[PDB]
From a paper:
Here we use structural and biophysical approaches combined with molecular dynamics to study transport by Arabidopsis thaliana LAX3, which is essential for plant root formation. Structurally, LAX3 consists of a bundle and a scaffold domain. The ligand-binding site is sandwiched between these domains with two histidines occupying positions analogous to the sodium-binding sites in distantly related sodium:neurotransmitter transporters. This architecture suggests that these histidines couple transport to the proton motive force.
In the presence of IAA, well-defined density is seen in the binding pocket. In this IAA-bound state, access from the cytosol is constricted by a thin gate composed of His189 and Arg192 on the M4–M5 loop, Val249 and Glu252 on M6b, and Phe326 and Thr329 on M8. This architecture defines the IAA-bound structure as an inward semi-occluded bound conformational state in which the ligand binding site is still water accessible. IAA is bound with its carboxylate group in this polar region pointing towards the apoplast side and interacting with the unwound portions of M1 and M6. The carboxylate interacts with Gln60(M1), Tyr242(M6), His247(M6) and the backbone amide of Ala59(M1). The indole ring of IAA is situated in the hydrophobic region defined by Phe143(M3), Leu144(M3), Val249(M6), Phe326(M8), Ala327(M8) and Pro330(M8). Here, the indole ring occupies the space between M1 and scaffold helices M3 and M8, with hydrogen bonding to the side-chain amide and main-chain carbonyl of Asn56(M1). His247 is of particular interest because it engages directly with the carboxyl group of IAA. MD simulations illustrate the dynamics of IAA within the binding site in the inward semi-occluded state. Notably, they show that IAA can flip 180° and interact with Arg192, an interaction that requires dynamic changes to the M5 helix.
Numbering used by the authors: 44 to 109, 115 to 341, 348 to 466
Write the structure that this text describes.
């Protein structure tokens, strides 16, 4: 894969469905805090990808001096022993199970907005089967070169949301109460945390390059483009509708029904189904290996049954993003990538003999360790501590409001 091919991957593996939920998040944070968090986590999310990049280079160089595919649960094994391999494997697979569920919930939610004759829960049955057929495909890693399409699908939707909101225009009923409560505020901040970071598949992309060393720069440019997709779409939609978004998690529910809006759903539905096969093809690999194992394709289904159940019992499109973000992404994409870097380079011989030197601008090892400590401290307290509690108390509130196995979420 070429260097530019990866940039299409880091930009398509980024916001897929959360792009629709970001406007809902700002209604809980306010426009000011909303912009700052995306920039704040955008840089931290881009910084942790660098941490995953130096770790991968260190692993391969050590292993080459003493191969077809590498993954995160194996890089930790080589550097920090098998104890971290189990730690990384569980958190990644748990994030893929729920991360894959979010796609199924999003697909069912989006389709409802072009054909409302069937309720959203029923659409989870139809799309659940259309997402359970992923077991009948050997793998999607071989088709990671078509990521340029995913960027186009996300690019059009982001530019529609901002342009459509601006043309729609706000009205007298529109109000912007900003951070009304801490439960809502931290729930929104967790959606932005869930948005950025790398999504745990940042180590597989690097192995496809002719020169994996320069990935750290590519991701930063890939995150800068994402901010161009999220900052104007989320800021504009919030401006047009304001607090009305609080009861409308999906931005497409508020924008007027139009042929252009239909395109947003159709293009976005494809991008989420493919993103569903990208967040489940690793699950079908670990799962089959664990059980030892068309004789194989059908056997993958057991993994899908949890995806159906979670997607149907908790169709909470908006709040689920925060529930996954605070408990799993905060420990899978921010804290573990940061702890591993600190542990591996803790010994003096490893640090001095590091394959790649630390950045001069950051300030050498002293700067890198200080930043890594901040990442762990900030995400652990705000990302997991406050974010987890606020997300959970907001998540359970959905159960009271809409009930278990709700027929339809946040629809008229
Ligand atoms: O970032 C998101 O909205 C979710 C997402 C996009 N690509 C993914 C790959 C694996 C797991 C989750 C995601």
């Amino acid at each position: 894969g070429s260097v530019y091919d990866a940039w299409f991957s880091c930009a398509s593996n980024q916001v897929a469905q959360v792009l629709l939920t970001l406007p809902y998040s700002f209604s809980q944070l306010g426009m000011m805090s909303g912009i700052l968090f995306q920039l704040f986590y955008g840089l931290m999310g881009s910084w942790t990808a660098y941490l995953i990049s130096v770790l991968y280079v260190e692993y391969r160089t050590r292993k080459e001096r003493e191969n077809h595919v590498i993954q995160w649960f194996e890089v930790l094994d080589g550097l920090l022993g098998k104890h971290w391999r189990n730690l990384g494997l569980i958190f990644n697979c748990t994030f893929l199970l729920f991360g894959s569920v979010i796609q199924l919930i999003a697909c069912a939610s989006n389709i409802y907005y072009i054909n409302d004759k069937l309720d959203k829960r029923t659409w989870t049955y139809i799309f659940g089967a259309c997402c359970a057929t992923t077991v009948f495909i050997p793998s999607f890693h071989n088709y990671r070169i078509w990521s340029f399409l995913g960027l186009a699908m996300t690019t059009y939707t982001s530019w529609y949301l901002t342009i459509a909101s601006l043309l729609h225009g706000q009205a007298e009923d529109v109000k912007h109460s900003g951070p009304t409560t801490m439960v809502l505020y931290f729930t929104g901040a967790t959606n932005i945390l869930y948005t950025f970071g790398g999504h745990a598949v940042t180590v597989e992309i690097m192995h496809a390059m002719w020169k994996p060393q320069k990935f750290k720069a590519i991701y930063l440019l890939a995150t800068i483009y994402v901010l161009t997709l999220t900052l104007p779409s989320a800021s504009a939609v919030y401006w047009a509708f304001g607090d009305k978004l609080l009861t409308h998690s999906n931005a497409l529910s508020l924008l007027p029904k139009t042929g252009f809006r239909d395109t947003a759903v159709i293009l976005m539905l494809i991008h989420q189904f493919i993103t569903f096969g990208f967040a489940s093809t690793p699950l079908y690999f670990v799962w089959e290996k664990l059980i030892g194992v068309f004789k194989r394709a059908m056997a993958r289904l057991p993994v899908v049954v949890p995806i159906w159940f979670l997607a149907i019992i908790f169709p909470f499109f908006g709040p689920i993003n925060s529930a996954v973000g605070s408990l799993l992404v905060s420990f899978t994409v921010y804290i573990i990538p940061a702890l591993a870097h600190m542990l591996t380079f803790a010994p003096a011989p490893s640090r001095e003999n590091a394959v790649e030197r630390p950045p001069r601008v950051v300030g050498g090892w002293m700067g890198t360790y200080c930043i890594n400590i901040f990442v762990v401290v900030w995400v652990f307290v705000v990302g997991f501590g406050f974010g987890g509690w606020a997300s959970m108390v907001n998540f359970v509130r959905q159960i009271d409001t809409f009930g278990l196995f709700t027929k339809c979420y946040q629809c008229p």
